[PDB]
Design a binder for this molecule. Structure first.
Ligand SMILES: NCCCCCCNS(=O)(=O)c1cccc2c(Cl)cccc12
Ligand SMILES: NCCCCCCNS(=O)(=O)c1cccc2c(Cl)cccc12
Ligand SMILES: [Ca+2]
Ligand SMILES: [Ca+2]
Ligand SMILES: [Ca+2]
Ligand SMILES: [Ca+2]
Length: 148
């Protein structure tokens, strides 16, 4: 069905090196500490150890390369891809940001051959903006069009 590409593994390899900040090869609680404090978090060495227990299937207090890739190579996120929401995002995203804005929608309805006033477009993006609000993304379009 789908063909995996070495590109994915390279992605997990870039994040791995970004975490280890001491040339070690293994991610400890100290290195990870600076990994969460340099991004946007201020937890502690104790709570951190707890977040490491789930990323440790041996009992060593650290993570290796086969555990970091086997954990993030499975799921990590959710990006449904169907022939329906695929063409839709391809026609609503002509700038590149990869997001549908109330403005673009206005220029898309007039091109197809219809006539919607700014009031109709803004109200539309609002009914589909359940988690974005102000902007829409892939997931939103997949959960706004399909619904029992
Ligand atoms: N979670 C968003 C902020 C960080 C983004 C980069 C890291 N992304 S992550 O949160 O998936 C992640 C990466 C590497 C080690 C982790 C350990 Cl030891 C525990 C929990 C998550 C970990
Ligand atoms: N290959 C299948 C393509 C299916 C396209 C369906 C388009 N369905 S739609 O015209 O109702 C529509 C288009 C673009 C954005 C929308 C937002 Cl943000 C909210 C509500 C409706 C939206
Ligand atoms: Ca190290
Ligand atoms: Ca381990
Ligand atoms: Ca766009
Ligand atoms: Ca939204």
């Amino acid at each position: 069905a789908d063909q995996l590409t070495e590109e994915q593994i390279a992605e997990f390899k870039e994040a791995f090196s970004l975490f280890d900040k001491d040339g070690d090869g293994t991610i400890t609680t100290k290195e990870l500490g600076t990994v969460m404090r340099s991004l946007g978090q201020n937890p502690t060495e104790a709570e951190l150890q707890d977040m490491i227990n789930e990323v440790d299937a041996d009992g060593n207090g650290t993570i290796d390369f086969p555990e970091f890739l086997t954990m993030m190579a499975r799921k990590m996120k959710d990006t449904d891809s169907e022939e329906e929401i695929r063409e839709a995002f391809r026609v609503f995203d002509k700038d590149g940001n990869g997001y549908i804005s109330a403005a673009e929608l206005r220029h898309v309805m007039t091109n197809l051959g219809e006539k919607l006033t700014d009031e109709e477009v803004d109200e539309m993006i609002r009914e589909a903006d359940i988690d974005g609000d102000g902007q829409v993304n892939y997931e939103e379009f997949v959960q706004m069009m399909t619904a029992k």
